[PDB]
Amino acid sequence: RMSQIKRLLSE
Amino acid sequence: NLDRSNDKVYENVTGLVKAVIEMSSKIQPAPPEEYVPMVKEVGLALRTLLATVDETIPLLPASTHREIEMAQKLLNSDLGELINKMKLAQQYVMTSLQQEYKKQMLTAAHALAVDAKNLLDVIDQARLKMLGQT
Numbered sequence: 753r754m755s756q757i758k759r760l761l762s763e
Numbered sequence: 764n765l766d767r768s769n770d771k772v773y774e775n776v777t778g779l780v781k782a783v784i785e786m787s788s789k790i791q792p793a794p795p796e797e798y799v800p801m802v803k804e805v806g807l808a809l810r811t812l813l814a815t816v817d818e819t820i821p822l823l824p825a826s827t828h829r830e831i832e833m834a835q836k837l838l839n840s841d842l843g844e845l846i847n848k849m850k851l852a853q854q855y856v857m858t859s860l861q862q863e864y865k866k867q868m869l870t871a872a873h874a875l876a877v878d879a880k881n882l883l884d885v886i887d888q889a890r891l892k893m894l895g896q897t
Contacts, residue, residue: 753869753873754784754787754788756873757780757783757784757787757873757876757877758784760780760876760880761777761780761781761784
């Protein structure tokens with residue numbers, strides 16, 4: 753959920 | 764890889780993704796006077812994003828235009844779909860269903876972010892092509 757977008761957020 | 768120092772697309776996609784994240788983290792505790800503004804805030808980010816892309820298109824090879832425009836199509840679609848759920852959740856404020864409609868907002872926004880992320884991917888592939896990457 754939260755954790756999923758939060759990674760791709762800073763690549 | 765790519766220098767992002769003045770990549771407007773990348774900033775605009777970041778700021779739209781942050782907007783979805785912001786809304787999501789905030790949504791549950793939140794009444795309509797708080798959660799409508801944040802959706803506005805997403806939409807605005809989205810438009811800023813599509814405008815930038817419109818300016819970039821003509822700089823990128825011909826063969827990639829279709830695919831992008833479609834990724835743009837989609838983003839609007841997603842936003843629409845998020846507003847629908849937004850309106851539903853407002854209809855049913857302080858009722859049994861409030862929360863389960865906020866769920867379908869979260870689903871819609873997570874779609875939007877995913878698709879914006881995908882749009883960014885397309886653009887890159889386009890630049891890389893146009894920049895002469897091997």
